[PDB]
Amino acid sequence: DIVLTQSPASLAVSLGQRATISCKASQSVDYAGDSYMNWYQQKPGQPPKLLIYAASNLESAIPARFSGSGSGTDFTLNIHPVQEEDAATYYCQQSYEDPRTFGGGTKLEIK
Amino acid sequence: EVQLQQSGPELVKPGASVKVSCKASGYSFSDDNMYWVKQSHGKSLEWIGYIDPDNGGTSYNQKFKGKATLTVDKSSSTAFMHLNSLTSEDSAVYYCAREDYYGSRAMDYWGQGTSVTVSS
Amino acid sequence: TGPIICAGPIHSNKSADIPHLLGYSEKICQIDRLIHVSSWLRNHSQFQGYVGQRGGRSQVSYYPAENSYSRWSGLLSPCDADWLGMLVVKKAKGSDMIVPGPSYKGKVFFERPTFDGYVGWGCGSGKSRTESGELCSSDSRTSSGLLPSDRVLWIGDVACQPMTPIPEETFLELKSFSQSEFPDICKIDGIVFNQCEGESLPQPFDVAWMDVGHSHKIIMREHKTKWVQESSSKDFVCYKEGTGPCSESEEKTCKTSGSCRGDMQFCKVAGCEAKCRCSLVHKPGEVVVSYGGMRVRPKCYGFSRMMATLEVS
Show the beta-strand stretches assigned E in chain A.
4-7, 10-13, 19-25, 30-31, 34-35, 37-42, 49-53, 57-58, 66-71, 74-79, 88-94, 101-102, 106-110
Please tell me the distance in Å from B64's CA to the nearest CA on chain C.
23
Q: Are strands C109-114 and C185-188 parallel, antiparallel or unpaired?
A: unpaired
Q: Are strands A34-35 and A30-31 parallel, antiparallel or unpaired?
A: antiparallel
Instruction: With CB atoms and an 8 Å threshold, state whether B110 touches A49.
Output: yes
- Provide the residue range defining the domain that includes A105: 4-110
Chains that touch C (3 or more CB pairs under 8 A): A, B
Q: Which of A53, A54, A60 sits opposite C126 (nearest CB)?
A: A60
3-state helix, strand, coil in chain C (%, to 5): 20, 30, 50
Q: Are strands B68-73 and B10-12 parallel, antiparallel or unpaired?
A: unpaired
All domains in chain B, ordered by first residue: 3-112 (2.60.40.10)
Per-residue buried b or exposed e for C40-78, using 16+ beta carbons within 10 Å of the residue's own CB: bbbebbbbebbbbbebbbbbbbbbeeebebbeebbbbbb
- Is the separation of the CB atoms in C13 and C66 below 8 Å? no
Give dist(CA A29, CA A27) in Å, integer: 6
Q: With an 8 Å Cβ cutoff, is B27 touching chain C?
A: yes
Counts of helices then strands in chain C (DSSP H, E): 6, 22
Q: Which of B62, B105, B110 sits opposite A95 (nearest CB)?
A: B105
CATH of the domain at A59: 2.60.40.10
What are the residue ranges of helices labelled H in chain C?
A: 24-32, 35-44, 78-83, 168-181, 248-256, 264-270
- Looking at the structure of chain A, the number of domains it has is 1
Counts of helices then strands in chain B (DSSP H, E): 0, 11
Instruction: With CB atoms and an 8 Å threshold, state whether C137 touches A54.
Output: yes
Give dist(CA C270, CA C140) in Å, integer: 52
Please tell me the distance in Å from C95's CA to the nearest CA on chain B.
10
Domain boundaries, chain C: 24-158, 168-227+285-310, 230-280
Instruction: With CB atoms and an 8 Å threshold, state whether B104 touches A103.
Output: no
Closest C-alpha to B21, from B38, B9, B39: B9
By three-state DSSP, how is residue C85 classified?
coil
- CB atoms < 10 A from the CB of C187, how many? 18
Query: Taking CB atoms and an 8 Å cut-off, how many pairs form between chains A and C?
Result: 23
Which own/partner contact pairs does C21-27 have at CB distance under 8 Å and 24+ positions apart?
A: C21/C248, C22/C248, C23/C245, C23/C246, C23/C247, C23/C248, C23/C251, C24/C233, C24/C234, C24/C237, C24/C248, C24/C251, C25/C237, C25/C238, C25/C239, C25/C245, C25/C246, C25/C251, C26/C245, C26/C247, C26/C248, C27/C83, C27/C84
By three-state DSSP, how is residue C35 classified?
helix
Give dist(CA B31, CA B54) in Å, integer: 7
Collect all residues of chain B within an 8 Å Cβ-Cβ radius of residue A46.
Answer: 112-113
Give dist(CA A39, CA A93) in Å, integer: 6
Q: With an 8 Å Cβ cutoff, is C90 touching chain B?
A: no
3-state helix, strand, coil in chain B (%, to 5): 10, 50, 40
- Is the separation of the CB atoms in C271 and C208 below 8 Å? no
| φ, ψ (nearest 5 deg) of residue C185 | -105, 130
- Is the separation of the CB atoms in B94 and B37 below 8 Å? yes
Measured between CA atoms, the residue of chain C closest to residue A53 is C137
